[PDB]
Amino acid sequence: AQHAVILDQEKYDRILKEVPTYRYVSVSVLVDRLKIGGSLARIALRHLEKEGIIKPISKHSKQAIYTRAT
Amino acid sequence: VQTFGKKKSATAVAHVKAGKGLIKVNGSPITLVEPEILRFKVYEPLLLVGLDKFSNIDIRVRVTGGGHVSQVYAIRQAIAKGLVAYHQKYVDEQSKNELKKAFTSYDRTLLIADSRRPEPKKFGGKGARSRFQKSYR
Amino acid sequence: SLVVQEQGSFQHILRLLNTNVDGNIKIVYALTTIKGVGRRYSNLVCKKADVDLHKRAGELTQEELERIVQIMQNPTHYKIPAWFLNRQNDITDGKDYHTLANNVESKLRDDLERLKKIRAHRGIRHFWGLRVRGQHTKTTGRRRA
Amino acid sequence: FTPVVLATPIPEEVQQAQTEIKLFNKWSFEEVEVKDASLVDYVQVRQPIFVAHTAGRYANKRFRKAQCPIIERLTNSLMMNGRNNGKKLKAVRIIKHTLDIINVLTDQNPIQVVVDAITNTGPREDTTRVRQAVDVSPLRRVNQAIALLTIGAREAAFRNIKTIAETLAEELINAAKGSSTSYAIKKKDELERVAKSNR
Amino acid sequence: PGVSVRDVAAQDFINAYASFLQRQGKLEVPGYVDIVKTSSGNEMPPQDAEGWFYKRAASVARHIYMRKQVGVGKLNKLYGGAKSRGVRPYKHIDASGSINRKVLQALEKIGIVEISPKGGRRISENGQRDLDRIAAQTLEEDE
Amino acid sequence: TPVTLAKVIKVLGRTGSRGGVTQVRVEFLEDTSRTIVRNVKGPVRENDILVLMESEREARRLR
Amino acid sequence: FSHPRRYGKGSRQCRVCSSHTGLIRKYGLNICRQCFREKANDIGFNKFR
Amino acid sequence: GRVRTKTVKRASKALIERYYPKLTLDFQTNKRLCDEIATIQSKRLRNKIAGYTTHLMKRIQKGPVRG
Amino acid sequence: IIKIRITLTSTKVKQLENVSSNIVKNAEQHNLVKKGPVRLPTKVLKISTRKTPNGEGSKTWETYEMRIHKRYIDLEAPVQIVKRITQITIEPGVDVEVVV
RNA sequence: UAAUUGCGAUAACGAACGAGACCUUAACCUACUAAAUAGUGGUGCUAGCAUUUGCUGGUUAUCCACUUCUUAGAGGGACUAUCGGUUUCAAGCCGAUGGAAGUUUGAGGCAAUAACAGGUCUGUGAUGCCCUUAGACGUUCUGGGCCGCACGCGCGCUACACUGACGGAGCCAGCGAGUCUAACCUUGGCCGAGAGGUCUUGGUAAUCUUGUGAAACUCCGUCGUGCUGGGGAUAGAGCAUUGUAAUUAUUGCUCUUCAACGAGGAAUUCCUAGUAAGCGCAAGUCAUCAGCUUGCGUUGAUUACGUCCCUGCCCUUUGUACACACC
Ligand SMILES: [Mg+2]
Ligand SMILES: [Zn+2]
């Protein structure tokens, strides 16, 4: 609750212009790059896995491996 | 014809018969062994010599006795030994040796069952060698 | 999962049934902060009230809160089994209750005070501050302060 | 190329494994060369493996540990903490996820990345408690680099959001690149700090 | 083209059979959902109340189709795992008998499973039919 | 950073109070015609190659 | 003169020494743990491992 | 260790003292002859005797041995 | 004629085989038909106990065993070749139960 | 060398006890033997799926043949085999090949002359002496105590969490035990949420529990890093079981407050490969009760292959006014 609890929409352009400067994307990577809290990521990454820039590497659970669009 | 394979206490009995590429493991196919990480440990004695390499044989294995990993190693040894025996008997021993060379040069107990059996535990401590904690004072 | 922008329709730590509730936690385990409801009781009542347990109190509702509270206050009438209640056959009426207030402490101290007024061994032990459920006192729970 | 199939339905993504230049199930193996000359004979690529779970004898003799796949040795080092004793399937899934993360970030042949990490984190001089500045065998270099990498991963992933797979990932990546921001390289440089002061 | 329960092993089979019990509309639920933990040695009920009984039905059906007659004690010992008994070492605890008994009775009423001449429950003819239906549907759906 | 590495050709014996260190007669890889004696902690055999930053420092027995 | 002693350690005794402690109630021995150690070979019980 | 005791070594020497125009330097055709010319009461001890006799007669072709 | 099953059980393997081999030749000398002698697995009756008759010393445990062995042979013969054959196996130490 | 194991040096030579050898068990044997109390195929009995006949299948009195897996008898097999390096001259050691097994092949049982004022008279209808013996220190009955709590110590169980908790899902062992004067192991139905109750059934046993459908573990989801949904100490209420008798809660089950614990100071224990550790199961103690022990298997590492820095022990030397032998 210390940071990025439920909304993170005052800077809602950073759900779009976030891919550059890091090629990786993960549940930990999102909470690491000072943007979002891990209380929503497991379903927030699903939006972009279904339609977006991130391609899954495997069928991982309890983990995340996504790569940028080539 | 029939072979067996063991790792610690599991035994996997394989029947190799003339047929059309049917590889059953528990009634399910070899693709559904479900260690989910040792699923490529059961493809070793096939991928090794030739990736497909075989539409003439049918391997029906049934494994009972150990644990998940022990039974996966048991089936991966049983299919290997079944292939070796079938080639030795029916196809030719030249080719059985030519695939035994690959099996032994990748040996992961495929042809020879591992000898490591559970060493008996001795009184005065959990485990065979580990002893209970002692206090002097 | 969906649009949760909700510029002014978010709720911070909030007010419910004598206890402040952290609206940043899923409703069941957040509500477990009320003294008298735990994990399973909160899960049962919140899946009876047909509220979504996958959300936090900051967005859930403003009336389902008091609805769930009333379900807690009248558990046996809203089709909840009797064995699911923490206080059954209370001491003098046979009914089955569930204390959810700054009242479980008062009911416990009332049980203790009657157990001391009766001059029972359990009451005497609670008076002396020692363990009461047949524990061994020779080695454990020495300082307790 | 060579789309041979048979009665048991398995996609030919695995039937294309060895007909060409051999690789892992996901990563090229022939692009593996150590950045040094001394840690050979103790790092054991080639033979290659399909999964780092070769449950074979490696502790009966003295110098047979060196002929164990380095990826499985790294898994065996994660095979630690007591809580994660056993759980070899857990540790091998962790290594698979870590190798995938290296594939994704600074791809650089992830297996080459981890072996380069080991080589760059192998302590070349230590101190014996007599503190005498003794030298370090290549085998001790290799397994102590593996231990340092794994324990840095462990106490990085402990009590924080990122999981053991990604902590192991960035630890190895930093060790391969040779930066002093990770735990393993800092500890190796600490061990080599007493190299001139105890000769 | 020759599909059985043993062509999809463990999870993609549920991923279609549970949806099949959803579509069937017959709930077969006795109302204990949201009230039971499904095992005496558990600490919580299933997270999602809707779906766990359908997955129990699918699993019981597949479990008695892969083998011969199966009894209530068998399913109890199977589905019941370890228990956090406190400051004591964990220990295998059997599962809740009532839920397995009622899922067996539900499969009875729906005709997926029948009685056996020696005791216990054996998969019925329409049970094998239905299980092969889900198997062959899943195989062509997602290999 | 000066560059030099060597290879143990003759392992002499154990050294150290507890028996952890081993003496090795090393043949240098560059300037091969030179046998220098060194001390090493880990297990070493013949035909093994060591990295030693300092090139000329005869490490002796550790009493 | 005597209350029921049909269960518990008081119900059984060593068939030889009648000691109520250490009793070997296995395979139908009903012998003391020391009296059995003494007369073990004579029953057919021996040491091999 | 793999050191042989006196009841191995002395019996082997006694066999080689009187059976040199006899069993060759091969263990398989050594133990067989031991079976019929020695009252060994255990196959493990027989194997020990025959192996040490094989070693003795293998090194006999490199110079005479003491005793 | 009557069909019977003989069960042979003992601790003494030597005399257990002394009867399991005597019975086969005593049925061959009358040229009967019989299912082969089946050897049920030996029950190892391992029993741990304390060497100490008291509670002093190093904790040292000692196990005992009475390994029990048992076999079974089925055949059919007339009543005289049943009784005169069950009167052959009286080897002291091997117990014989003949069921019909 | 594990060894007074051997080589060898040599007023010794030849030996004996111990060690070893031996026995038990654990590894192997497409070799012999024999098996609906073990298992496998093929004929009918067949329900699905596909239909050119095949996948999974049940067919516990339904057909034949067999012994690869299982079992247990007799045997076989390893003796560091062979080849190299090092061996003073050998004993041996070290590599590689092959081998099922190459560290005494792994683990045990047995364990010389002996010494302890080590423990046990509370195991004995073993027993000297002393004491007690009719208000008994004998035996028996009721009740309480052994468990009691300013505190110190040891053996342990559970944790501090994301390599994790929680839920569904996969469904993977071995060692055993289990009742005829009778209530033991319990399969299968119905009820309850659960412990548990209930109507039965099989098992005196490779036959039934039991395929002990064990646990850890594996898959997918909930949790999001919080003294938190980690941890379950403490206490409250209710239901059963065991027992003549649960109060000082035997135990199990349901709900509830949810303590310390942020990985541990000085110190300190165990251990070298199926071993440490993690995991549970069986048996013993049992009318009931494990956090205990004895065995067992599932998962399976790290480091080492050395040494006398510490401790312990042995041998040798050495001093003695000791010989009841430093009490
Ligand atoms: Mg006491
Ligand atoms: Zn006795």
Swiss-Prot record, chain C:
Protein localization: Cytoplasm
Record keyword RNA-binding present: yes
Residue(s) carrying N6-methyllysine: K47
Gene Ontology MF: a single term: rRNA binding
Database matches in PROSITE patterns: RIBOSOMAL_S13_1, RIBOSOMAL_S13_2
Covalent crosslink: Glycyl lysine isopeptide (Lys-Gly) (interchain with G-Cter in ubiquitin): K35, K48, K79, K95
Tagged with keyword Ribosomal protein: yes
A GO-annotated cellular component: cytosolic small ribosomal subunit
GO biological process, one term: endonucleolytic cleavage in ITS1 to separate SSU-rRNA from 5.8S rRNA and LSU-rRNA from tricistronic rRNA transcript (SSU-rRNA, 5.8S rRNA, LSU-rRNA)
HAMAP family: Ribosomal_uS13 (MF_01315)
Subunit structure: Component of the small ribosomal subunit (SSU). Mature yeast ribosomes consist of a small (40S) and a large (60S) subunit. The 40S small subunit contains 1 molecule of ribosomal RNA (18S rRNA) and 33 different proteins (encoded by 57 genes). The large 60S subunit contains 3 rRNA molecules (25S, 5.8S and 5S rRNA) and 46 different proteins (encoded by 81 genes).
Entries under PANTHER family matching the protein: 30S RIBOSOMAL PROTEIN S13/40S RIBOSOMAL PROTEIN S18, SMALL RIBOSOMAL SUBUNIT PROTEIN US13
UniProt protein name: Small ribosomal subunit protein uS13A
Highest classification ranks of the organism: Eukaryota, Fungi, Dikarya, Ascomycota, Saccharomycotina
Swiss-Prot record, chain D:
Cross-link Glycyl lysine isopeptide (Lys-Gly) (interchain with G-Cter in ubiquitin), where in sequence: K26, K177
Pfam families for this protein: Ribosomal_S7
Keyword Ribosomal protein set for record: yes
Protein's GO biological process: cytoplasmic translation; maturation of SSU-rRNA; regulation of translational fidelity; ribosomal small subunit assembly; ribosomal subunit export from nucleus; translation
Domain of life: Eukaryota
Main location: cytoplasm
Record PTM Phosphothreonine, positions in chain: T8
GO CC annotation: 90S preribosome; cytoplasm; cytosol; cytosolic small ribosomal subunit; ribosome
Assembly behavior: Component of the small ribosomal subunit (SSU). Mature yeast ribosomes consist of a small (40S) and a large (60S) subunit. The 40S small subunit contains 1 molecule of ribosomal RNA (18S rRNA) and 33 different proteins (encoded by 57 genes). The large 60S subunit contains 3 rRNA molecules (25S, 5.8S and 5S rRNA) and 46 different proteins (encoded by 81 genes).
Protein name: Small ribosomal subunit protein uS7
Swiss-Prot record, chain F:
Main localization category: cytoplasm
PROSITE patterns, per the entry: RIBOSOMAL_S28E
Protein name from the UniProt record: Small ribosomal subunit protein eS28A
InterPro entries, per database record: NA-bd_OB-fold, Ribosomal_eS28, Ribosomal_eS28_CS
The organism of origin for this protein: Saccharomyces cerevisiae (strain ATCC 204508 / S288c) (Baker's yeast)
Xref: Pfam families: Ribosomal_S28e (PF01200)
Function summary: Component of the ribosome, a large ribonucleoprotein complex responsible for the synthesis of proteins in the cell. The small ribosomal subunit (SSU) binds messenger RNAs (mRNAs) and translates the encoded message by selecting cognate aminoacyl-transfer RNA (tRNA) molecules. The large subunit (LSU) contains the ribosomal catalytic site termed the peptidyl transferase center (PTC), which catalyzes the formation of peptide bonds, thereby polymerizing the amino acids delivered by tRNAs into a polypeptide chain.
Phylogenetic lineage: Eukaryota, Fungi, Dikarya, Ascomycota, Saccharomycotina
PTM annotation: N-terminally acetylated by acetyltransferase NatB.
Other known facts: Present with 94500 molecules/cell in log phase SD medium. There are 2 genes for eS28 in yeast.
Family the entry assigns: Belongs to the eukaryotic ribosomal protein eS28 family.
A GO CC term attached to the entry: cytosolic small ribosomal subunit
From Swiss-Prot, chain H:
Portion of the parent chain present: 2 to 68 of 136
Keywords on record: Cytoplasm, Ribonucleoprotein, Ribosomal protein
Secretion signal span: none
Subunit structure: Component of the small ribosomal subunit (SSU). Mature yeast ribosomes consist of a small (40S) and a large (60S) subunit. The 40S small subunit contains 1 molecule of ribosomal RNA (18S rRNA) and 33 different proteins (encoded by 57 genes). The large 60S subunit contains 3 rRNA molecules (25S, 5.8S and 5S rRNA) and 46 different proteins (encoded by 81 genes).
Protein name in UniProt: Small ribosomal subunit protein eS17A
Single Gene Ontology MF annotation: structural constituent of ribosome
One GO term describing the cellular component: cytosol
Function description: Component of the ribosome, a large ribonucleoprotein complex responsible for the synthesis of proteins in the cell. The small ribosomal subunit (SSU) binds messenger RNAs (mRNAs) and translates the encoded message by selecting cognate aminoacyl-transfer RNA (tRNA) molecules. The large subunit (LSU) contains the ribosomal catalytic site termed the peptidyl transferase center (PTC), which catalyzes the formation of peptide bonds, thereby polymerizing the amino acids delivered by tRNAs into a polypeptide chain.
Main subcellular location of this protein, as a coarse class: cytoplasm
Localization per Swiss-Prot or TrEMBL: Cytoplasm
Record-stated family: Belongs to the eukaryotic ribosomal protein eS17 family.
Extra facts: Present with 30900 molecules/cell in log phase SD medium. There are 2 genes for eS17 in yeast.
Organism per entry: Saccharomyces cerevisiae (strain ATCC 204508 / S288c)
